[PDB]
Scaffold this active site. Structure first.
Site, PDB file in Angstrom:
ATOM      1  CG  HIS A 102       6.261  -8.938   7.144  1.00 28.25           C
ATOM      2  ND1 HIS A 102       5.576  -7.781   6.849  1.00 28.25           N
ATOM      3  CD2 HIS A 102       7.572  -8.602   7.166  1.00 28.25           C
ATOM      4  CE1 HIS A 102       6.435  -6.787   6.703  1.00 28.25           C
ATOM      5  NE2 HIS A 102       7.654  -7.259   6.890  1.00 28.25           N
TER       6      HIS A 102
ATOM      7  CG  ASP B 257       6.014  -9.877   3.235  1.00 32.12           C
ATOM      8  OD1 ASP B 257       6.827 -10.393   2.439  1.00 32.12           O
ATOM      9  OD2 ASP B 257       5.106 -10.510   3.804  1.00 32.12           O
TER      10      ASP B 257
ATOM     11  NE  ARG C  44      -3.368  -0.459   3.035  1.00 29.96           N
ATOM     12  CZ  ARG C  44      -4.605  -0.477   2.542  1.00 29.96           C
ATOM     13  NH1 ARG C  44      -4.977  -1.443   1.708  1.00 29.96           N
ATOM     14  NH2 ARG C  44      -5.474   0.471   2.887  1.00 29.96           N
TER      15      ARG C  44
ATOM     16  CG  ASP D 111       0.845  -0.708   5.767  1.00 25.96           C
ATOM     17  OD1 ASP D 111      -0.085  -1.215   6.418  1.00 25.96           O
ATOM     18  OD2 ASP D 111       1.029  -1.000   4.568  1.00 25.96           O
ATOM     19  CG  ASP D 112      -3.799  -0.057   8.408  1.00 27.31           C
ATOM     20  OD1 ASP D 112      -2.954  -0.419   9.257  1.00 27.31           O
ATOM     21  OD2 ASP D 112      -4.943  -0.559   8.318  1.00 27.31           O
TER      22      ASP D 112
ATOM     23  CG  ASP E 296      -4.186 -10.400  15.610  1.00 27.66           C
ATOM     24  OD1 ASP E 296      -4.264 -11.430  14.912  1.00 27.66           O
ATOM     25  OD2 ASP E 296      -4.887  -9.400  15.376  1.00 27.66           O
TER      26      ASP E 296
END
Length: 331
Positions: A87, A41, A14, A109-110, A188
């Site tokens: 990752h 990744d 992204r 990243d978001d 998670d």
């Protein structure tokens, strides 16, 4: 004393990792105290070019194995989750083994960070180092929508049994414990299992220090709080479990329907008691609180208690004080 704490950004395909990095770099108080490592990744070229354009402001590393992963029979639809777990294993291994850092704040990243994101982690890192009953500090309030948080208390913090991820600090010592049994997928929810958590809590805020972009209703804190100048001793387990619990059970009890309709407004802090899985679900739904459970633990729950604001009133959705552990069968 100020400590060096790296920020590990998890990226893939992204181009909007740009927004994530721009906010981190804008608010970072020191490149020395908060080195940023972007682990990418997927080999998405456009994203690689974007990250490289920041030059030395960050360190760009690339997950080496781009091959497809053999999944188990129940997971044909979930290749992406196996790749995410691979990752994380590789990136955390890099930050703790190759770079040899003592801790790290993991940022997807978001996520866009709040102005006091760095201050928050600098202040809470010593608590995490000193209290073995804590295993992380998270920037996320699972029930952090604007109408459910007290904007007059941006400095207020809590303990939670529900690992929130979404901007979280862990110690190298915890990676040493998790790495040998790291899962193939769904990392998670795996951390949320009792076999991994071992009864440990995370610190989380009244107002989130991260927000997702591109969960969408969580409000990002915008009022800078000087956490390093505050006394956070109230978060130590012994003090918290005495004082916060006495506060919750000392509060008057109200039936959920009375809270929903705003009856007895003179009571600014109340307790709504649930007694079983069905009542927890029903009451959480009636008050607009997340009602899903992971290994029997409610979102932002602590000793089964979910704390939030409802129509300006502080509410603790709580089990009887005889509570003594989570039951994973509450699904």
């Amino acid at each position: 004393e100020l400590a060096v704490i790296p920020i590990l950004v998890i990226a893939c395909d992204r181009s909007t990792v740009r927004r994530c990095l721009d906010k981190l770099l804008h608010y970072r108080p020191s490149a020395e105290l908060f080195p940023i490592i972007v682990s990418q990744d997927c080999g998405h070229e456009e994203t690689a070019q974007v990250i490289a354009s920041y030059g030395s402001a960050v360190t760009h590393i690339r997950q080496p194995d781009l091959s497809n992963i053999a999944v188990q029979p129940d997971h044909r639809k979930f290749q992406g989750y196996y790749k995410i777990a691979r990752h994380y294993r590789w990136a955390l291994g890099q930050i703790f083994h190759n770079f040899n850092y003592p801790a790290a704040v993991v940022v997807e990243d978001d996520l866009e960070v709040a102005p006091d994101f760095f201050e928050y982690f600098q202040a809470t890192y010593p608590l995490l180092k000193a209290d073995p009953s804590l295993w992380c500090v998270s920037a996320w309030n699972d029930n952090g929508k604007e109408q459910m948080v007290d904007s007059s208390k941006p400095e207020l913090l809590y303990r939670t049994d529900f690992f929130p991820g979404l901007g979280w600090l862990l110690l190298a010592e915890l990676w040493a414990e998790l790495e040998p049994k790291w899962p193939k997928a769904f990392w998670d929810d795996w951390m949320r299992r009792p076999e991994q958590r071992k009864g440990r809590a995370c610190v989380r805020p009244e107002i989130s220090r991260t927000m997702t972009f591109g969960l969408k209703f969580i409000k990002l804190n915008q009022q800078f709080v000087p956490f390093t100048q505050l006394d956070l001793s109230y978060l130590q387990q012994e003090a918290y479990d005495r004082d916060f619990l006495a506060r919750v059970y000392g509060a008057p009890q109200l039936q959920v329907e009375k809270v929903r309709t705003n009856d007895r407004k003179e009571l600014g802090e109340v307790r709504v008691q649930y007694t079983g899985r069905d009542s927890f679900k029903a009451f959480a739904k009636a008050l607009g609180v997340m009602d899903d459970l992971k290994s029997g633990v409610p979102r932002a729950g602590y000793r089964g208690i979910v704390t939030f604001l409802f129509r300006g009133r502080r509410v603790h959705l709580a089990p009887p004080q005889t509570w003594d552990g989570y039951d994973p069968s509450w699904t």
